[PDB]
Amino acid sequence: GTITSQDDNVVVGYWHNWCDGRGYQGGNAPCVELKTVNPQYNVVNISFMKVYDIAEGRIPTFKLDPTIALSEAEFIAQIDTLNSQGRSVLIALGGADAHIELTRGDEDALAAEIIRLTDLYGFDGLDIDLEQAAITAKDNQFVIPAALKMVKEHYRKTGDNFMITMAPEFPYLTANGAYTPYLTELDGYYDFINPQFYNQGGDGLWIEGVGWIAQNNDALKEEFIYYIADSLINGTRNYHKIPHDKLVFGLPSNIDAAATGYIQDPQDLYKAFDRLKAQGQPLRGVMTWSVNWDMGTDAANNSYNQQFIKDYGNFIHNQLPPV
Ligand SMILES: [Ca+2]
Ligand code: NA
Structure with a gap:
């Protein structure tokens, strides 16, 4: 169809093209239809565009998993509904074991397949998630x-x-x-970056007055969010610069969705985001792995009950638009 684009704040959520993924604490993430995804996810990333079979060669593609029990036509129309609601649906290139190993020259074919997929399913863009x-x-x-x-x-x-x-x-x-080549080569072309602030254990940064601030330290979560984002949007503390109106903070939905990086107390994020707003540099929104995890179960089959989007959706959508 047409491209449905986002000019305001975003809550980004990843969509599993598979069923019943097992979690880091024994939980389950089911497959779900697009139509079920919470409307406050205004960017949804179809995961994943990849190499399905080497017989088909090096260029990745997308094949809707049949176990989901959604026809290709129904899927296309659900996309169209999300678009009529003004929400975007991207294709996420990469993931684990995607077997993407391209040679110089391949860019013609890859451009061509992205376009084909985009015209067929009515996607609005693409997320690099190698x-x-x-x-x-x-x-x-x-x-x-x-x-x-x-x-x-x-x-x-x-x-x-x-x-x-x-x-x-x-x-x-x-x-x-x-990752600096991807950023530099596509500066002027990219809408926004949503880095993963999860699964990196004790990586982090040092801040005079505070000390060592790790991504897996809950006691210091407020400071982690604030200083890491401040560093990115200002290009300081040896981080490559990403403008604030183009930075989106990536997080796990819950403790099953990633090994580390889950925010136990949402107020840490709320506060950090206000320090950033008050210094004249509000972020563009948040991101999560994933909607399927937000709609899933822990290891005793209790429902996560859409806790992530409950904690952050109104917070982010009721912020003033970016410039
Ligand atoms: Ca932390
Ligand atoms: Na579309």
Whole structure:
């Protein structure tokens, strides 16, 4: 269809193209139809575009998992509903064991497949979410940016903003870290970055007056959020700069969705976000792995009962728009 783009604040949630994933604390994440996803997720990321079978070759694609029991046509129409509600639906390129190892030249074909998928299913953009091994694999750092420049240009002809987002793990965002080529090559092209502030154990940063602030330290959660974001939006403390109106804070829905990084007390985030707002640099929103985890069960089959979006949806949607 057309591109449904986002000009305001966002709550981003990832969508599993599989059923009954097992959690880090023994819980379960079911497959769900798009239509069931909470409306306050105004960007939903279909996970994942990848290589399904090497017989098909090196270029990744998307195949709707049949175990979900949703026809390709129904799926397409659910996308159309989300668009009529003004919500976006992106394709997330990558994930674990995606086998994305592209060679120079591949960008033509990759641009072409992204466009095809976009016209077929009515996606509005694409999220780069490479696994660790894919970040610096073969020519990925050249090919993927180059393809997406061509996709962005294609949709400009007809006045559309094909969204481009990224979900780097945060330690790769140091100055001249492994993700810097993706950022630099696509500066001017990307809508916003939603880094993963989870699954990195005791990585973090040092702050004079406070000390060592780790991503897995609940006692210091308020400071972690504030200082890491402050560092990114200002380009200080040896972090590569991401403007504040283009930074989205990525988090786990609950303790089953990631091993570390879950926020026990939402007030830590609320406060940090107000320090950032009051210094004249409000963030663009939050992100979560994942909607399926927000709608899932712990290891005794109690429902997580949409706790993440309960904690953050109104907070974020009732903030003033970005400039
Ligand atoms: Ca922390
Ligand atoms: Na669309």
